[PDB]
Design a protein around this ligand. Structure first.
Ligand SMILES: *[C@@H]1O[C@H](CO)[C@@H](O[C@@H]2O[C@H](CO)[C@@H](O[C@@H]3O[C@H](CO[C@H]4O[C@H](CO[C@H]5O[C@H](CO)[C@@H](O)[C@H](O)[C@@H]5O[C@H]5O[C@H](CO)[C@@H](O)[C@H](O)[C@@H]5O)[C@@H](O)[C@H](O[C@H]5O[C@H](CO)[C@@H](O)[C@H](O)[C@@H]5O)[C@@H]4O)[C@@H](O)[C@H](O)[C@@H]3O)[C@H](O)[C@H]2NC(C)=O)[C@H](O)[C@H]1NC(C)=O
Ligand SMILES: *[C@@H]1O[C@H](CO)[C@@H](O)[C@H](O)[C@H]1NC(C)=O
Ligand SMILES: [Mg+2]
Length: 324
């Protein structure tokens, strides 16, 4: 079994690093953008799952998408459901139909909820941001496409609730579960053509890694870097070398792209990692490029400062257009 477990720390730690926003104020619908969660779950009957929930606001449409992965059997279910608009309100409550992400707390941190009521993808997961934030870029912002993005991750939030599998409602064990909640919003429609994002956990340590790889055709540079949150709020912003490996592949159901299923990362001054997708099919299938993503549970080995490590996490592979 994977050693899923929550942290029990303060969300912004010492507040000694002057990040460029307040977390709570960044959560409401009015801020726009993307709300995302990946829950690493052990149930009370000792089954393990990875559950994804994601709402995106976009000028053309909205969508909610979600998936479940059974870590014992590789059974995987996903859907994408398209909406038209996001209510412009001062609280967090985003949905398409009876599926969405909402805050159940005045601070938008102590209780958040990802829920889905779709055939073969039904769950109701709450989480509490008892976990030190990953402030991407060091202070929470970095260049993303033609302009800026703002992004923070809450890596190991205490998680409760249920997921329903084959008619059986299973209860989440909060001692052996955690949720990475990722909040991201931007100021430009011209986002990168495509990217890979890694979310990494190293259970022997407090390291939480949020790594981005994509091309910047506006500056004509390559973006390839990790933000690593360590202990005591310490944050590393490090270049990396990215190698996608196509010995194993998954062809998209859209017919438009072939995903690699293994990777190498060399994070400058920190370590190197060999990462592998847990199972082939982990694709959220949309009607266009932006609605589609490879969102896959991964495991990895490697070293950190020349000491061997292993861990798990998630890889996201997104094309905002198939004409890159
Ligand atoms: C974001 O998404 C991109 C796209 O999926 C990912 O990039 C790819 O990564 C893989 C793995 O690393 C690369 O595969 C390698 O490709 C080697 C060959 O590279 C050279 O050829 C490429 C193909 O060129 C042809 O096709 C493209 C369209 O697919 C045309 O634009 C191009 O003009 C060529 O067209 C002719 O051939 C096709 C048939 O293939 C016919 O249909 C046409 O009619 C033409 O006759 C080309 O894309 C490569 O360019 C890339 O790299 C150079 C640097 O060398 C850079 O200058 C370019 O701007 C571009 O980035 C290159 O010329 C091959 O030898 C090797 O074995 C392996 O297969 C793949 O090339 C990458 N593609 C691109 C566009 O970058 C990327 O990883 C992903 N990012 C993240 C973070 O996930
Ligand atoms: C939401 O409404 C407020 C107040 O009415 C307005 O100032 C703001 O521009 C709106 N936000 C968006 C994204 O339209
Ligand atoms: Mg909607």
């Amino acid at each position: 079994k994977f050693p899923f477990k929550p942290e029990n720390s303060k969300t912004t730690g010492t507040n000694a690093i002057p990040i460029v926003y307040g977390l709570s104020e960044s959560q409401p619908n009015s801020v726009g953008g993307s709300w995302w969660s990946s829950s690493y779950i052990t149930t009370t009957n000792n089954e393990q799952y990875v559950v994804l929930a994601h709402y995106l606001d976009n000028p053309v449409y909205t969508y909610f998408r979600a998936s479940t992965l059974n870590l014992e059997t590789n059974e995987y279910h996903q859907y994408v459901t398209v909406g038209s608009s996001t209510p412009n309100i001062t609280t967090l409550d985003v949905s398409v139909g009876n599926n969405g992400i909402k805050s159940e707390s005045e601070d938008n941190l102590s209780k958040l909820r990802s829920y889905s009521n779709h055939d073969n993808v039904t769950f109701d997961i709450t989480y509490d941001a008892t976990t030190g934030a990953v402030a991407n870029g060091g202070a929470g912002t970095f260049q993303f496409g033609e302009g800026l993005t703002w992004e923070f991750g809450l890596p190991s939030a205490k998680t409760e609730g249920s997921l329903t599998v084959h008619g059986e409602k299973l209860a989440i064990d909060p001692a052996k579960s955690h949720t990475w909640y990722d909040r991201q919003w931007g100021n430009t429609a011209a986002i990168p053509s495509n990217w890979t994002w890694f979310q990494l956990h190293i259970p022997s340590t407090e390291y939480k890694i949020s790594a981005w790889i994509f091309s910047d055709p506006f500056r004509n540079t390559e973006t390839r870097f990790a933000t690593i949150r360590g202990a005591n709020d310490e944050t590393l912003v490090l270049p990396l070398e990215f190698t996608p490996i196509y010995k194993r592949t998954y062809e998209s159901a859209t017919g438009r792209v072939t995903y690699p299923l293994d990777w190498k990362l060399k994070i400058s001054g920190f370590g190197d990692f060999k990462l592998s997708s847990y199972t082939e099919d982990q694709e959220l299938v949309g009607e266009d490029a932006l609605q589609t993503a490879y969102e896959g549970f991964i495991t990895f080995s490697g070293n950190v400062h020349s000491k061997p490590v292993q861990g798990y996490g998630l890889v996201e592979i997104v094309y905002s257009t198939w004409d890159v």
